[PDB]
Design a protein around this nucleic acid. Structure first.
Lengths: 159, 160
DNA sequence: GCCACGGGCGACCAGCGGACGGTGAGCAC
DNA sequence: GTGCTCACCGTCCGCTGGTCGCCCGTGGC
């Protein structure tokens, strides 16, 4: 498998141009990973093995073997909060992307910018970020990062 | 010395004391209740610290229980008798009548264990072979990992 | 061609879930 | 004690989930 093109900040309907991938692509990867999970579940059930509820190393292995190693653990864990903000607050995810673009910032920056509206979101639902993940059917299958929980708790602690 | 080694289990009628240097089955089942309480504690603690919050009885929860002076709630034992506990949660009457029978015949815990599998497999088959589903349906079972062996045996009954 | 800009993902690790049988307690006579 | 019953639970192991920072692609010159 060839090393994949770097991501760049994008708008909801906007294409990436050069040797670069867009954010809508990024989000699609999570959809694909969900489908691969579903496959792995069906296979496991037919073999009579344990059936995973989350996107595990097993599911990554499956995706890779199906020729999609670009869906790998490091990357997926890296941009989860972004994906979460997209699933939970479409409008906000979008308008933020717009802004980050207008200012001309990198993915690394956009990442950080995604944390804060998510923390706001958690605070509005009794600080229960883990609850938010378990509520949305497309987030249910992703482990909630330590860092997000921490940052929610620190906003609880300071404000 | 966080605990002296515990008395062996013996087959028991629902509510029989289990006289001797021996523990009964209702005690066995109580251990799972205690483990659930310790899980609940660990959850509350984690939430107040802002750490990750477990949904199942993990090594962390066992460590907690041990530190609270209940190392008799340990992973090997708990994983050993889960299907028994599951049958108890899902089919009280059956769990009971089975215990009665195993007693009347005069069997050891090791035997009663095996006898517990089969009504459970029947149970799974009646809910589209989804034993993992059964665990996730009952609010007292959702906190326990489903053993490989139970899944296998459900699948073999599907196959044979 | 040089060389910095920045991120995709290899690789390592701490600890988990699983699993077994070694030790050691239990018993009726 | 006797010989012997038999299960509690330490202990080890193969991964997993998390982590992070290199090596490599990429770009303006």
């Amino acid at each position: 498998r060839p090393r994949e093109h770097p991501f760049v900040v994008t708008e909801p309907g906007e294409l990436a141009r050069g040797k670069k991938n867009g954010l809508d692509y990024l989000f699609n990867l999570y959809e694909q990973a969900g489908k691969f999970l579903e496959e792995v579940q069906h296979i496991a059930r037919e073999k009579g093995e344990k059936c995973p509820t989350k996107v595990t190393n097993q599911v990554f292995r499956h995706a890779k073997v199906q020729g999609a190693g670009y869906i790998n653990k490091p990357k997926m864990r890296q941009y989860v909060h972004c994906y979460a903000l997209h699933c939970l607050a479409s409008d906000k995810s979008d308008e933020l992307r717009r802004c980050c673009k207008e200012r001309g910032e990198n993915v690394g920056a956009w990442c950080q910018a995604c944390y804060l509206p998510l923390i706001k979101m958690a605070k509005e639902k009794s600080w229960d970020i883990e609850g938010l993940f378990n509520s949305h059917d497309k987030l249910k299958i992703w482990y909630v990062p330590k860092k997000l929980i921490q940052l929610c708790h620190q906003e609880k602690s300071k404000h």
